[PDB]
């Protein structure tokens, strides 16, 4: 309940425009995230006169208002296509991951650097029972000091909305079993 009340506390002591941005995020995070990814590649007036721009700004300026004082470990699911793995690791119905596909994902993410951008919703714990597990790839990242992380509530749970402006370097991947399905856990 402590983290619940802290998230509900942060979500009141902020601007009303930031509340509007975050509330619009609670339902339409898809196109908002796509915009935070691909916004920087337009014209100046194209960027400024765009309607979705300013609220982005607002929500952006919300993220940077809550920095962390020490490195924090976060976990989130990711599609393998985000790491240039253009095929399926395992069908969403299958339970086992082949050794060949595992070795391929290993040799295709060995020592690359993948720049990130846009908003991202993360958690502070490994997903368990009831948690949404959309992709067979789970990333366990360590966010450094002074990283803006805004906690919020989507009317049933608590999430941590951050904005990623770095590049990820996957070090090691391992096979995991959760609730009877095999996943890949990568350290970044």
């Amino acid at each position: 309940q402590w983290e619940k009340k802290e998230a509900e506390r942060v979500e009141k002591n902020l601007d009303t425009l930031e509340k509007e941005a975050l509330e619009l995020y609670k339902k339409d995070s898809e196109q908002i995230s796509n915009y935070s990814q691909t916004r920087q590649y337009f014209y100046d007036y194209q960027i400024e006169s765009n309607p979705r721009e300013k609220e982005y700004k607002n929500l952006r300026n919300a993220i940077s208002k809550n920095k962390i004082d020490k490195p924090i470990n976060v976990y989130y699911f990711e599609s393998p296509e985000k790491f240039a793995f253009n095929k399926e690791i395992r069908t969403e119905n299958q339970n086992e991951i082949s050794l060949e596909k595992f070795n391929e994902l290993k040799e295709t993410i060995q020592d690359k650097l993948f720049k990130q951008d846009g908003f991202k919703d993360v958690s502070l714990y490994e997903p368990g029972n009831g948690d949404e597990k959309p992709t067979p790839l789970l990333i366990h990242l360590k966010l450094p000091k002074n990283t803006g992380m805004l906690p919020y509530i989507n009317s049933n749970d608590v999430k941590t909305l951050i904005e990623q402006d770095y590049s990820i370097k996957i070090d090691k991947i391992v096979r995991i079993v959760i609730e009877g399905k095999q996943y890949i856990k990568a350290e970044a």
Binding site: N129, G130, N156, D157
Partner: protein, 51 residues
């Protein structure tokens, strides 16, 4: 004094409160915030009674 006679005490139910079961995010059944009284007045207004 009137109870020490043919007079009897009758009991009669004026209302009953209770819960119903739903499944939460997990596969667990919850019956705590689910009150039947929220639906009685509704069920009694869109139905016919058959005994």
């Amino acid at each position: 004094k009137k109870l020490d006679s043919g007079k009897q005490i009758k009991l009669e139910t004026t209302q009953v409160s209770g819960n119903y079961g739903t499944k939460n995010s997990q596969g667990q059944i919850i019956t705590e915030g689910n009150s039947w009284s929220n639906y009685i007045s509704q069920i009694d207004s869109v139905s016919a009674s058959i005994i």
